[PDB]
Design a protein around this ligand. Structure first.
Ligand code: 2FY
Ligand code: 2FY
Lengths: 208, 208
């Protein structure tokens, strides 16, 4: 059923640093995740140029932001390329061992955490606001998996027996009890206007 | 021998706009190309995690900047993943039809040309300083090709019968007669310090 994995030592370190370093500009987490979704959307778009049957699983390419105040979650859904099980396990598709090394070396050279996505490890900036991230993903090659962590050096992967999604990745952020501002419609609008105003796919902010 | 292709109408338009729009901050072209090389280097690195024989063609991952004042060229060499012939033809691996659409829509909404790489069409910013770009590339799956354009709505692809390179892509910029500043060691250093100081692969500026 549930398989448990250890983060590579470097990714464990990165995460600890994101959770432990005092850093007020937490909002950048949404830019990082939107831009991840935008990159995955490019990949399914590039691939459908040569093989247009890859879109049999969803012809519409978009990003949705779903806050839910009861569950204290913000969900970023994209209909991008999705991850195989192998991708999930290899640090959600990233070059995370050397991306972290490069990042922790930019840090001790005049850079701040906001430059995280330049090293290809943006996803972990989710840990700025979330106490637990759950990642549901579906690639055309493979079945649907749920990936999950509350940091602490381990993550779980299970085949997700719940709701089919067709193709893409849903990042569910279970927010820290003091970061509920990121559930407010006004707050989300502002961040999307400020950090992601020129992203080439519809972004849709759901209402409650 | 030499096959000639037509740029897609949108890419033709983008290029014309890059060549024709008055825009003084031409230097951003080097940031765009370095960051393309860095992305390709990530791809061969991600792929060698699962299959370490993909590095049989070059174990070292780096970017080199080679000015040559006699030929009036600046060459950006990377040992990244390389392009197949198909990739070369599909707009050098980019989503260029819709990336341009997204870009030309950011333009008439408060954005300037420097935001070009956010739409995945950074490569064409080469036309800010070059009268002709020649692209030599080698992917592990395929042979070695030269791709070439002086804009005007057409590009050529030939199998490159010259010097083997092992794996990667070399972008040769044949500079406009008034943009030779980009051949100066001081000028290149400054741009690399200002726009690309935290890129996670060695960048080496060759000397003449
Ligand atoms: C591999 C690309 C992918 O599916 C993905 C990864 C991280 C993320 O925050 C969003 C995504 O869509
Ligand atoms: C497909 C990635 C690739 O080989 C490449 C493309 C454009 C570029 O300026 C440099 C590159 O290395």
């Amino acid at each position: 059923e549930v398989e448990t994995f250890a983060f590579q030592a470097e990714i464990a370190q990165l995460m600890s640093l994101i959770i432990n370093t005092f850093y007020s500009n937490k909002e950048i987490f949404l830019r990082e995740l939107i831009s991840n979704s935008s990159d995955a959307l490019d990949k399914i778009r590039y691939e459908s140029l040569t093989d247009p049957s890859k879109l049999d699983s969803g012809k519409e390419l978009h990003i949705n932001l779903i806050p839910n105040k009861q569950d204290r979650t913000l969900t970023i859904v994209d209909t991008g390329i999705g991850m195989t099980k192998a991708d999930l396990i290899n640090n959600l598709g990233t070059i995370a061992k050397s991306g972290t090394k490069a990042f922790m070396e930019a840090l001790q050279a005049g850079a701040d955490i906001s430059m995280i996505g330049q090293f290809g490890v943006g996803f972990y900036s989710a840990y700025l606001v979330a106490e637990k991230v759950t990642v549901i993903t579906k690639h055309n090659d493979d079945e649907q998996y749920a990936w999950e962590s509350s940091a602490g050096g381990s993550f779980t992967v299970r085949t997700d027996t719940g709701e089919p999604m067709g193709r893409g990745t849903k990042v569910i952020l279970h927010l820290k009890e003091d970061q509920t501002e990121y559930l407010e419609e006004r707050r989300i609008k502002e961040i999307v206007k400020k950090h992601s105003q020129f992203i080439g796919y519809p972004i849709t902010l759901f209402v409650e």
